[PDB]
């Protein structure tokens, strides 16, 4: 096993006297994927630009002025390449899967789109109205309206807080140029990385970017990469209330240290021993995880998960469920509670299975070509390299009881959560009562 | 050199439970376990228990009893119970002791 | 070394072939395919292939409910079953030592399920939302329905225990119909991440049943059913079909690639707001080949028949071999990608090691594809144009239209 | 006057199973036909008759079986239904057809046409003792016609076909298309594709 890990393929990086940095795995595969991923988001929006980065992903395909429309998709189609992408607050990607057969090919269509995209004025005004449409659709998967209000309130004020999607207004009136004042702004080597796992040899990568990607820095500036502005979080709550819906569903959370930090690793230990439940399991009888296990007895809830999204300097440690109008309550309280017990009174037993528990999904979250792909992708851009399994193995197969505790505690006890709430919630007590449930009366 | 079956036989004629008609099982007192154990009851076996009960509490409510001849006897008491209630108590156990 | 190790396939004196590929992955999977399934169902009996798929946590005689999720768990352990109308796969994943741990639990699910009365009893309400869950998404409806107006005996069986049968399945039903289904010759203990010689030294325990084929899924007689199903959605979901194509049959191969060959035709040849596919489902002693529409309500009539012109102008003589060339190379394609993921991957080393208890490598799996074209498609497409055609639907309809309209 | 006046309608086979075991299958089949006025009704009426004690005599053991007449204003319907024990509904569906089929391939004596002429004049005039039945009557002509078919004509026109008809209005039923409607186990039950 861990020899298993060991003779796991290093991933070769290295970056362009341009700023990309190429970085791949190589297996036996004939197949692969291969991407940009652009340290480009909603964050990096303002109040008349925010939209732009997804008013883009949506252009980012229908085109490039080398080769139109028909032509591109046509190309791509018949060659059986599957590109596909998304963009998120501070995290955007284009990536393509192919036969490796194709790297140099793949690598240019990527390299004339991040470049060169038609935004043909008329093709503009088209997905206009479809994003404000596709926009009216993303709103009634309450499983997410949910955690943007938890943004907009958990960091008010800030740029997170704005959601990827972006205001109508915005979408209803970007201009021709926005999307290039945002794709020119943003869309830069340096913070662009092109990765790839599957059966290509690196170098061949390379001298491809290296190739297509002729990219050329004069000044200082061109080859720095700027920080962001500091995200407040804010204690708070946002209340969409609606008996209308069939039910209700609540988030809450307290800030994440971002990714950098050594911590996350604990926490996401942390986010482990409770995990999630979900009606289909089959466990009244589940691990430890009380909260699956009281959420059975009790019938709590119809689906609850832990997550410790993060991001360059923040991030947002909690817990999400979905429940009737009537167990709402009981089901927070009987949660919360994990919370507190979670770091204040955590046993070892308990952090084996959590560990091995990711030790399952640390494996299982590279599974494939596309996914291995994401996190060179990924740690490169926000970590600096890239985590090996063999790494991640240690780091967090060396988390004890006690490092729990002192973690969860250091980020969860007496600290002021924000709360999102959705749905039929008249059950759900105040603030000051889900905020006295962040201190347990040891 | 005295039975334990002896005894037995002795203790539950003396216990007298059966004069009211019902079997020892049907005495044991319903606690977290002998619940779960009924509750895995066949249908068949729970009416039966409970029209036991219900006679039982009858008879006992008239401070009559039943004809002699309807007493159950000692040997042809049936343990109904004893099994699912058995099974339960080590499913307990053996939950009890993986969660520490 | 280099990681290649050639995946060996050892028949046992049963009928239980083992297949196993020591990839080195640092998480492996062991995976208990069986080729029951809810095509071998009566008219009674139904849905206890599903509910089956559900007692999979079920006390065994190995280890209880609980020693069972929390054994599972406390490993890091996923224990699951995905089933198709007629294969049952039993997978389980974990890593390391811990394989041979997990082990002991998927052994136990598979052969000694005493499904308790009481546990069944108690877990048949489950039929009713897993089923609820599932039906969120109109998709499944439609094709529920599809083989029932495909078919008409076994396989034309629902996949989802009908409703009314909710809580009558007997503990007994479920022993057997397994006791008839679950034998040797009918399953195969796949898996990855594993050395052979250890795989192979638990069949020896899972030695418990031979019967070969104890039950038999009826033949599938073929029927040009049609079932509409009312109930404005505001966009109708529709499926057309004409039975075809059977695993392993040569015949196969062909719609994959009229599969492909059809798509940027249908659609394309449909414009507006939709959707709108090529249809294939390959099964052991029959198949299915069409297209399903998601489409507007009003806007219902018209894509089905666009949609199905093409299917028909297809046939003939609108097929330039290019057409083939590129499509031929798609599922070249989708072929191998969806090989990447160990879980579609142990997909494909299972299903083979099952129906035949060989291994196509991908290079002759691609001379075979590679093998026909021009040759059939333009005809595979004709071969729908001509035979009977079974309809199925969701939506408002009032504005869709019946087989007998074309 | 008519401010929607609903589609004519159309025709289909269909055919639409309910598995839901019953212990007890119903199943009916029918051919379009006979519309309420179109002079081509009475002839089932009097096949209705025509047809039943042949149906049901022709089906031994524990059952039921029928045979069903439905006229509409552009259209109707004609068939049997056969509540009939599950294993034993292929069976009782089957042979309740054979006679539907036989019936029009010569098996109806001009007597068999005299009886069942009679038991509508019956079942007519019976069904039209109690005034909720009856005020059904001056109510259904006062509406789709506007007059009054008195007892005597009407009978005068059921009594004015015979021989004449039946016989072949049971081989419309056996040529054109069939659909089926069918409740139960069906696990023994039969389609129409199997007649």
Known sequence: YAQALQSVPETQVSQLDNGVRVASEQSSQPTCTVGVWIDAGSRYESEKNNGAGYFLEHLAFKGTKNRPQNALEKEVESMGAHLNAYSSREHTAYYIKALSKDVPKAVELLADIVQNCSLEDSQIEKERDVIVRELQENDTSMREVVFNYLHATAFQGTGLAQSVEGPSENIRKLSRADLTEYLSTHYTAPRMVLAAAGGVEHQQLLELAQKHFGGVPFTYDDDAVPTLSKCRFTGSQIRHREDGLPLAHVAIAVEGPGWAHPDLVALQVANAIIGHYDRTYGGGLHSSSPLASIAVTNKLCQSFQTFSICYSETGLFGFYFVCDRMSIDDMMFVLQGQWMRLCTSISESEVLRGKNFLRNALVSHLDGTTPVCEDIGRELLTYGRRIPLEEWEERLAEVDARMVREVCSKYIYDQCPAVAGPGPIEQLPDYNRIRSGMFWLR | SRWLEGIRKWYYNAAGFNKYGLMRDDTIYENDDVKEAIRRLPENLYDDRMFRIKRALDLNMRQQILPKEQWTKYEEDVPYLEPYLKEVIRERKEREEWDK | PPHPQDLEITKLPNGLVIASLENYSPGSTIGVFIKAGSRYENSSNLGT?????????????????????????????????????????????????????????????????????????????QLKIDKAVAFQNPQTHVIENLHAAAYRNAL??????????????????????????????????????????????????????????????????????????????????????????????????????????????????????????????????????????????????????????????????????????????????????????????????????????????????????????????????????????????????????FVDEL
């Open chain 3, 49 to 125: 292939s599903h509910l089956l798929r559900l007692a999979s946590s079920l006390t065994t005689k190995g280890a209880s409910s609980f020693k069972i999720t929390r054994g599972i768990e406390a490993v890091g352990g996923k224990l699951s079953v995905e089933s198709t109308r007629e294969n049952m796969a039993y997978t389980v994943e974990c890593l390391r030592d811990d394989v041979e741990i997990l082990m002991e639990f998927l052994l136990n699910v598979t052969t000694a399920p005493e499904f308790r009365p009481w546990e069944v009893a108690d877990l048949q309400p």
């Open chain 3, 156 to 401: 034309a069986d629902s996949l989802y225990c009908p409703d009314y049968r909710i809580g009558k399945v007997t503990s007994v039903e479920l022993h057997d119909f397994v006791q008839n289904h679950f034998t040797s010759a009918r399953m195969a203990l796949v898996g990855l991440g594993v050395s052979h010689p250890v795989l192979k030294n638990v069949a020896e325990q899972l030695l418990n049943i031979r019967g070969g084929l104890g039950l038999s899924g009826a033949k599938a007689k073929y029927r040009g059913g049609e079932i509409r199903e009312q109930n404005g959605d505001s966009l109708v979901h529709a499926a057309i079909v004409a039975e075809s194509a059977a695993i392993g049959g040569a015949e196969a191969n062909a719609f994959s690639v009229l599969q492909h060959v059809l798509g940027a035709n249908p659609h394309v040849k449909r414009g507006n707001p939709f959707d709108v596919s090529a249809f294939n489902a390959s099964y052991s002693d029959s198949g299915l080949f069409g297209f399903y529409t998601i489409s507007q309500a009003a806007y219902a009539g018209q894509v089905i028949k666009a949609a199905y012109n093409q299917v028909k102008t297809i046939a003939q003589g609108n097929v330039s071999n290019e057409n083939v060339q590129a499509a031929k190379n798609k599922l070249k394609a989708k072929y191998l990608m969806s090989v990447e993921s160990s879980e579609g991957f142990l997909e494909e080393v299972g299903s083979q090691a099952l129906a035949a208890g060989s291994y196509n490598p991908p290079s002759t799996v691609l001379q075979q594809i590679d093998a026909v074209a021009d040759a059939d498609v333009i005809k595979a497409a004709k071969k729908f144009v001509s035979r009977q055609k079974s309809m199925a639907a969701s939506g408002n309809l009032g504005h869709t239209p």
